[PDB]
């Protein structure tokens, strides 16, 4: 798993983590999220309000076009509901829709891992979406509360780490974009945290 990781990731993750100011600066954007989401603590987490028949997303404040970036998402297991998707989006991706869906990854402007189903979405309405990671250690993975999201803008990849192990690149084809941390959620009163881990 780790032999596929971006250059510099092991060193980035071993460094002292960004302080609370940096976590807020790179955290969720109150000015760039669904109307049904509130961003709290200056960006450290968001809460989705209990609005029926809605999927709701948020972007981070800072868009990345070069180098290696990583962040931790913390998403309580019992607050995931039917469609919990973690990834990245351009500034143009839609962040709300009036039904329950994997909104993140349902278009050209977003890329998501469904942490309930283990499926990857890009330009996908869901039918046929591939498993990630591929394999049997892949067929049994339960995504725990915390996961790392790893964006390599030199290779143009998005991948994830759990429990200290990089799980491989999930998506390629990201170069020449400005990409923001993103999630889409459906669960009433879910509280999803973002913890920026820095850049190389």
């Amino acid at each position: 798993g780790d032999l596929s990781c971006p250059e510099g990731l092991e060193e980035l993750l071993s460094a002292p983590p960004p302080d609370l100011g940096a976590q807020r600066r790179h955290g969720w954007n109150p000015k760039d999220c669904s109307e049904n989401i509130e961003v709290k603590e200056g960006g450290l987490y968001f809460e989705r309000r209990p609005v029926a028949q809605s999927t709701d997303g948020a972007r981070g404040k800072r868009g990345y076009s070069r180098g290696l970036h990583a962040w931790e998402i913390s998403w309580p297991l019992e607050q995931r509901g039917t469609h919990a998707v973690v990834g990245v989006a351009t500034a143009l991706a839609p962040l709300q829709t009036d039904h329950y869906a994997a909104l993140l990854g349902s278009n050209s402007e977003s890329w998501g891992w469904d942490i309930g189903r283990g499926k990857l979405y890009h330009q996908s309405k869901g039918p046929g979406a591939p498993q990630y990671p591929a394999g049997t250690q892949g067929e049994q993975l339960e995504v725990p509360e915390r996961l790392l999201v790893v964006l390599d803008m030199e290779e143009g990849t998005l991948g994830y780490a759990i429990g200290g192990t990089y799980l491989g690149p999930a998506f390629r084809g990201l170069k020449g974009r400005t990409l923001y941390p993103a999630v889409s959620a459906v669960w009433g009163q879910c509280q999803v945290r973002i913890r920026y881990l820095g850049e190389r």
Partner: peptide, 8 residues
């Protein structure tokens, strides 16, 4: 509340 903990 519905399946996703949202107000009906």
């Amino acid at each position: 509340k519905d399946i996703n903990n949202n107000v009906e």
